[PDB]
Amino acid sequence: IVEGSDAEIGMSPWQVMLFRKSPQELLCGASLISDRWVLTAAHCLLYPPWDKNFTENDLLVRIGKHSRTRYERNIEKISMLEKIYIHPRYNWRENLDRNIALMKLKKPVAFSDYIHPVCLPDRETAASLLQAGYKGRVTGWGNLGQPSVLQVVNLPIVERPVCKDSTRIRITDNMFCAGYKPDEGKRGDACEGDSGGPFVMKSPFNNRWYQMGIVSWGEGCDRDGKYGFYTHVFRLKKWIQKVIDQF
Amino acid sequence: SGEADCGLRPLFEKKSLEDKTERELLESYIDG
């Protein structure tokens, strides 16, 4: 996260951090959608160009964390993964279309004041909140150099035509872009390290937080005038349900 | 186990407390 502010304790209880087992290294963000299922981006797990093809046993996730450098005794929880599921139509060679993946925790995590699931959007919430100008939220650690505590940034969804002209890659309806114009009316943004993390919005109707998107591709914290893309969660909801209901 | 209690934060919505910037999001949602 760049140009963001310090998040408050328990402000993003669904935030999940994905780590490489050995050597230990933070790889991506992710989100808790139930006591045993975690949502993230497919490129966080599978990206051939960089020789990335992780298996369940190469990773682990930490949940309920606020500080990146200090251990939070009796607060944060660690979990191994039982299975990883990548969308079969995930396109890593072109536009990262359907850049989504699910990870099943080996053992269910206990919910607490610091660990709580985010909602998956329903049709009405998606139709209602997914509008240009409306702001969503992304959280992650600083790699602004790095951070102490979790960072937060609120970004406006961008007009589809503007998103299309910001990149030469072929965008699809399964993705949307968000961010402030390069001229600076504001300027926070998600970075490479926030890949896979959730883009959430709060429904004014029922006061609940919904994960509308998944942070897609990023390199460092610079997009050279471009906008970050997000996987459209509602559009891929049936796939998520298919995977969970069967496994 | 969220489907029912999902999206309601124990330290915020559950305690009738708002975080520092959620206002920014809610104010951005115009047309209805």
Side-chain angles (χ1 to χ4, degrees):
Chain A
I1 301 290
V2 267
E3 294 303 301
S5 58
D6 297 331
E8 296 154 67
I9 302 296
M11 190 182 91
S12 191
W14 37 75
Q15 188 61 50
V16 177
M17 297 292 94
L18 181 65
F19 289 86
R20 163 192 277 290
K21 259 182 180 176
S22 179
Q24 273 203 178
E25 58 169 349
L26 177 64
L27 298 172
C28 277
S31 66
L32 189 71
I33 60 176
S34 81
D35 66 1
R36 67 184 71 268
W37 287 98
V38 175
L39 195 56
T40 191
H43 82 274
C44 284
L45 303 169
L46 173 70
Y47 192 61
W50 289 348
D51 200 27
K52 183 179 299 184
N53 189 11
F54 297 123
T55 66
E56 296 69 26
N57 294 129
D58 298 319
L59 315 161
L60 63 79
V61 295
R62 289 193 168 85
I63 314 174
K65 246 195 168 306
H66 182 255
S67 169
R68 180 175 181 176
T69 57
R70 60 111 57 182
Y71 184 69
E72 308 169 72
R73 177 170 61 93
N74 299 313
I75 301 300
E76 56 176 286
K77 302 299 179 183
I78 182 173
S79 179
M80 296 303 119
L81 307 178
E82 180 185 295
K83 207 72 59 184
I84 286 170
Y85 306 76
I86 299 176
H87 198 292
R89 287 202 286 170
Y90 157 55
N91 190 330
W92 56 270
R93 26 166 61 82
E94 286 175 286
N95 53 8
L96 289 315
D97 174 63
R98 292 184 177 73
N99 187 10
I100 181 171
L102 279 165
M103 301 180 293
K104 189 181 183 183
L105 305 183
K106 191 165 297 299
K107 294 292 182 177
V109 67
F111 295 153
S112 67
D113 287 333
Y114 314 95
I115 297 184
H116 197 79
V118 62
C119 300
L120 290 181
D122 52 34
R123 199 198 70 75
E124 171 171 348
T125 298
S128 178
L129 303 181
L130 251 24
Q131 318 250 63
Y134 286 31
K135 296 178 176 179
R137 166 184 295 174
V138 175
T139 79
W141 279 312
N143 200 141
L144 324 156
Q146 294 187 179
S148 50
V149 303
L150 198 62
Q151 295 297 104
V152 62
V153 65
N154 300 139
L155 310 171
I157 293 166
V158 178
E159 302 270 42
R160 211 160 192 66
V162 176
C163 293
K164 187 172 184 172
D165 299 317
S166 71
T167 178
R168 288 261 69 202
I169 185 53
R170 178 182 72 280
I171 68 175
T172 70
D173 300 326
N174 304 317
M175 56 183 76
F176 64 89
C177 89
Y180 295 107
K181 269 50 190 174
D183 52 35
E184 177 134 67
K186 302 162 202 175
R187 172 82 311 207
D189 198 8
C191 309
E192 186 181 331
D194 305 308
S195 286
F199 172 95
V200 305
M201 301 183 86
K202 184 166 183 174
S203 178
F205 196 12
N206 64 190
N207 208 40
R208 298 177 187 253
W209 292 86
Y210 289 90
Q211 179 174 170
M212 310 307 297
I214 298 170
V215 176
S216 193
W217 188 273
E219 278 169 280
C221 284
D222 181 278
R223 301 180 188 285
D224 46 53
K226 293 168 168 293
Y227 298 102
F229 278 81
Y230 298 78
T231 300
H232 200 308
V233 176
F234 175 69
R235 287 182 68 91
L236 320 188
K237 186 175 183 177
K238 300 308 297 184
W239 175 77
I240 294 176
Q241 289 174 164
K242 177 191 87 69
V243 176
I244 295 175
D245 281 47
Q246 163 164 42
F247 301 94
Chain B
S1 305
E3 189 77 61
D5 209 12
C6 68
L8 294 177
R9 301 169 298 179
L11 295 184
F12 291 96
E13 285 75 27
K14 286 299 184 58
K15 298 179 68 178
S16 299
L17 295 176
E18 82 184 73
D19 64 60
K20 293 167 180 169
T21 66
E22 53 174 286
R23 172 203 197 188
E24 193 190 328
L25 297 184
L26 297 173
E27 294 193 314
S28 77
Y29 310 154
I30 312 301
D31 189 295

